[PDB]
Write a protein that binds this ligand. Structure first.
Ligand code: MET
Length: 530
């Protein structure tokens, strides 16, 4: 099946300003999208905001403004933040959008016609802050914002409330067996593996039916009405997850505005998602509820859900109320955008709860970006080493030459696999393993000495080095989008050879290609003091 590769981020609640977790999640979405464009594939990358519900509506009452005005302002803050982060996201969706509402109503009606929705009751715990239903085994004792004793979530530590309401219920219990069939028939559909095992364990135990509406008063009427029943509003999560379907059905103009909603997802060839990027906090919604709603509605299921961990700064929680902030724009302005992106993507795998510190950020910038990559780019473009400012023609290869050539030839296949898991950390590590080898080759060959001593040999060493830099850079280009362009310019790589699987091949850029102009004081990654 050739289709549009469809990658998504979560849509974020707009109760508060955008912060590191949102930037991180959308970055991972963006990188995956960028990588597939570089392979020459059609790509649709989606992100946006989750704007209904009690959480958001009560956050707006606290600031004492209209919910329309509140959501519009905060959404604008998210949009501004993502523009500034310099992503290449194809569309930013808002659940307040009138076309999204239509899709939600259409899906609700499908589930109902299917016989999977009945009028019943939820009597149990609920976390407003997570918009999540919880069993008693998943709550514990704690203190509210006044220090009085209350109940809170084991998952998140937010205050839980007891809800007792007549609600429309989805027959999630009926989908246990099909969900298990699905997890087992597609054992790469949840990444990383231990989160996949977590989901299977939970569904093995059995599933209760799920409340998919609430009484309209409880929601302060800030939600989508249930079709045919004005007294109920649709569960914010059913509304929210539907953004993926909505997103798959929107024709978008050149300025990123939605101009049309198509009747059937097949028309745009995006649905279902090839990868849903999510944080571990919302696994159940994506890996249990979502596929159950799709099975009910007769819609195809996503190929992969990837769930990452949470960040800390200096081994402590990130918060404004506590004395520990982490502003990604400010850190990007301080250290550079591609560098900050590299760090967030290199420092932690999706299994781990990663940690930022200025110390570690600088060690990576200095060690990997500057000393390993930057150093190497300057050497092979240097007028002192590359006297003619060109890609030379190689003479015969020694076994050492070939050992390095083999590493460069094998790198794309290996990096490809890692990007497709996805495991962006391993992909980066694989590229830099090859960069380190190219450096050790250059040190071994000492091409500066060869300029006087063996210019024929220098041709070979210099050529292999240029091509190693080009290939490594091509594969890192989803990670370092701006800097890879600079590198390609310095190397003088023609535009055509900067994307496409054709240019994964060793030798795509011919000898005689001229290097780009050298600039007075340019340096690729500027080292920073410790
Ligand atoms: C369908 S993705 C919804 C995610 C939710 N708004 C959150 O911020 O956790």
């Amino acid at each position: 099946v050739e289709k549009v590769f469809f990658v998504t981020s979560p849509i974020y609640y707009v109760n508060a300003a955008p912060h590191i977790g949102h930037v991180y999640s959308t970055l991972i979405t963006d990188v995956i999208g960028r990588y597939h464009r570089v392979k020459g594939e059609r790509v649709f990358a989606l992100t946006g905001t989750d704007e209904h519900g009690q959480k958001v509506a009560e956050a707006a009452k606290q600031k004492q403004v209209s919910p329309y005005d509140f959501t519009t302002a905060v959404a604008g803050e998210f949009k501004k933040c993502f523009e500034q982060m310099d992503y290449s996201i194809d569309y930013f969706i808002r659940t307040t959008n009138e076309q999204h509402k239509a899709v939600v109503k259409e899906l609700w009606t499908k589930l109902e016609q299917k016989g999977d929705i009945y009028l019943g009751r939820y009597e149990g715990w609920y976390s407003i802050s997570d918009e999540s239903f919880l069993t008693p085994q998943n709550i514990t004792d704690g203190v509210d914002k006044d220090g009085n004793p209350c109940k809170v979530s084991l998952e998140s530590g937010h205050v839980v409330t007891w809800v007792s309401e007549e609600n429309y219920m989805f027959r999630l219990s009926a989908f246990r067996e099909r969900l298990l069939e699905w997890y087992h028939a597609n054992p790469g559909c949840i990444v990383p593996e231990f989160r996949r095992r977590e989901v299977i364990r939970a569904v093995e135990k059995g599933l209760p039916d799920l409340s998919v509406s609430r009484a309209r008063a409880t929601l302060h009427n800030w939600a989508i009405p249930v079709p045919g029943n004005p007294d109920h509003c649709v569960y914010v999560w059913l509304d929210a997850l539907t953004n993926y379907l909505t997103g798959s059905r929107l024709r978008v103009d050149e300025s990123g505005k939605e101009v049309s909603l198509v009747d059937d997802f097949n028309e745009l060839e995006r649905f279902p998602a090839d990868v849903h990027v999510i944080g571990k906090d919302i696994l159940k919604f994506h890996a249990i509820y979502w596929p159950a709603f799709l099975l009910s509605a007769g819609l195809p299921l996503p190929k992969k859900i990837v769930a990452h961990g949470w960040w800390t700064k200096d081994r402590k929680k990130i918060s404004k109320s506590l004395g520990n902030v982490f502003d990604p724009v400010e850190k990007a302005e301080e250290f550079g955008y591609d560098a900050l992106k590299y760090f967030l993507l290199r420092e932690s795998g999706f299994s781990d709860d990663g940690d930022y510190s200025d110390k570690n950020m600088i060690a990576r910038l200095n060690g990997e970006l500057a000393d390993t990559l930057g150093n190497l780019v300057m050497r092979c473009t240097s007028a002192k080493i590359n006297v003619n400012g060109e890609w030379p023609s190689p003479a015969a290869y020694t076994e050492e030459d070939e050992s390095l050539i083999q590493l460069i030839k094998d790198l794309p296949g290996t990096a490809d696999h890692y990007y497709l898991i996805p495991d962006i950390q391993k992909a980066i590590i694989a590229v830099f393993d090859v960069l380190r080898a190219i450096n050790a080759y250059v040190t071994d060959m000492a091409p500066w000495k060869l300029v006087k001593t063996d210019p024929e040999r220098l041709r070979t060493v210099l050529y292999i080095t240029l091509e190693g830099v080009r290939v490594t850079t091509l594969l890192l280009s989803p990670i370092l989008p701006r800097k890879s362009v600079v590198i390609f310019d310095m190397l003088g790589v023609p535009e055509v050879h900067r994307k496409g699987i054709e240019n994964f091949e060793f030798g795509a850029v011919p000898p005689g290609t001229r290097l780009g102009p050298a600039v007075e004081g340019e340096v690729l990654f500027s080292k920073r003091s410790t």
